[PDB]
Ligand binder design. Structure first.
Ligand code: ADP
Ligand code: MG
Lengths: 177, 238
């Protein structure tokens, strides 16, 4: 797992973890309310840059505009989206009953240090699957470009040579609201 | 004052160095959201404007157009007026300055008749041709708003500063864009200024001529208007 900070927001830490061979996505979704984490569908996340750009947008929105959803975790799922409809974002970017991978995201607002051992214990009690490193090498395994193009409404004329090129277009969509 | 508010907004975590004031432009070595050492570039641009929305939307749209070279939009805070951009260009050797078109031209002004200069200027015209073919206007097309990015022994022109940019299929807007650049290049009073403009126009025309019969027609329209703009751009006894 990785624990990170956005430079202009030193007191907010975000933990990100990536799981493969996930067996209980349906169960996770059923219990989601009554757990706080966001469970994100990696088929729509092609890079760290994309994910971190949404985390940035989340903090900007909440600090300087308005929070639309329940907490930072859900707000970030919204901010990953190209559109303003909350339900659509949760549906498209949240895990699905058939998800075999997931990103587990959590904002930590307490100024204190994140308790990493407890955090890992909590995640593994929720997720039946195998954690792998949250990095671009592993994210490049699971993103679905075709689905991404459809969801982010990218034209067939747009033909990025590599993942960096694709990531740039998604960050654009994220930053523009 | 402006430096106070900006450094407070960014916090001491983010280093800044002012490079232009008016709407202040800074450079920073700090990526706005990738974990430290997980980014891929030495520095970035921060534009602060207490146009922000306009430039961001246009940068995003233009990136998706094949062949158009513009800075990456990295981050946008429209509530406070900040945009973070990819830093394009570099210092020319021998203290000739930042690698915008203006400085490149000055550096080569004593001996401009080379493949490097001609090819580079044609590439500048290609960028403007792509922009206009796709019905966008720059709005402030000076030699300072065209940045050369080194590519080995070659230079790759990029367009920057889209604060006044717009979507437009009007040949009048296209003609004025071309005229602004033409006059900016002529402004140096260089004995070679007309040649520079000719190389640029060659690049522009090639883009249109690559679009078959439709391109040739639209090019005739644009060039006709451009000449009218030139006529209307100089004193006449009405
Ligand atoms: N993407 C960029 N890469 C490098 N330098 C840039 C970039 N964008 C802007 N600049 C610098 O900032 C200057 C623009 O500053 P300024 O005149 O204050 O505002 P405006 O951008 O309205 O003209 C450019 O001349 C250029 O030197
Ligand atoms: Mg500028």
């Amino acid at each position: 797992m990785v624990v990170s900070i956005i430079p202009q927001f030193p007191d907010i830490k975000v933990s990100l973890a990536l799981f493969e061979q996930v067996k209980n996505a349906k169960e996770i979704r059923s219990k989601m309310s009554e757990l706080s984490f966001a469970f994100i569908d990696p088929r729509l996340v092609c890079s760290g840059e994309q994910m971190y750009s949404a985390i940035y947008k989340t903090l900007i929105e909440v600090k300087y505009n308005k929070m639309r959803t329940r907490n930072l975790n859900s707000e970030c799922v919204l901010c990953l989206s190209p559109t303003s409809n909350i339900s659509d974002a949760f549906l498209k970017f949240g895990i699905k009953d058939d998800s075999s991978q997931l990103i587990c995201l959590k904002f930590h607002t307490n100024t204190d240090d994140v308790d990493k051992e407890q955090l890992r214990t909590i995640m593994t009690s929720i997720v039946k699957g195998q954690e792998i490193e949250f990095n671009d090498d592993n994210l490049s395994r699971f993103y679905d470009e075709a689905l991404i193009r459809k969801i982010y409404k990218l034209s067939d004329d747009f033909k990025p040579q590599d993942v960096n090129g694709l990531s740039r277009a998604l960050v654009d969509a994220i930053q523009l609201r | 004052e402006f430096i106070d508010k900006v450094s407070s907004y960014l916090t001491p975590d983010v280093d800044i160095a002012p490079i232009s004031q008016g709407a202040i432009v800074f450079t920073t070595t700090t990526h706005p959201y990738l974990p430290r050492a997980k980014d891929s570039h030495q520095k970035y641009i921060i534009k602060y404007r207490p146009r922000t929305l306009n430039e961001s939307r246009l940068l995003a749209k233009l990136y998706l157009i094949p062949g158009l070279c513009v800075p990456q939009l990295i981050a946008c805070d429209p509530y406070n007026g900040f945009i973070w951009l990819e830093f394009l260009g570099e210092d020319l050797p021998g203290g000739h300055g930042f690698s915008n078109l203006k400085n490149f031209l000055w550096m080569h002004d004593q001996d401009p008749y080379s493949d490097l200069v001609a090819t580079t200027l044609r590439k500048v015209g290609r960028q403007i041709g792509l922009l206009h073919w796709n019905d966008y206007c720059h709005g402030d097309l000076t030699s300072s708003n065209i940045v050369l990015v080194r590519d080995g022994a070659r230079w790759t022109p990029h367009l920057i500063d889209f604060g006044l940019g717009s979507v437009s299929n009007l040949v009048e807007d296209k003609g004025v864009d071309l005229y602004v650049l033409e006059r900016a290049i002529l402004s140096t009073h260089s004995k070679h200024a007309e040649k520079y403009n000719a190389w640029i126009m060659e690049g522009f025309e090639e883009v249109y001529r690559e679009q078959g019969a439709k391109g040739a027609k639209k090019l005739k329209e644009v060039t006709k208007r451009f000449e009218e703009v030139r006529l209307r751009g100089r004193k006449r006894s009405m």
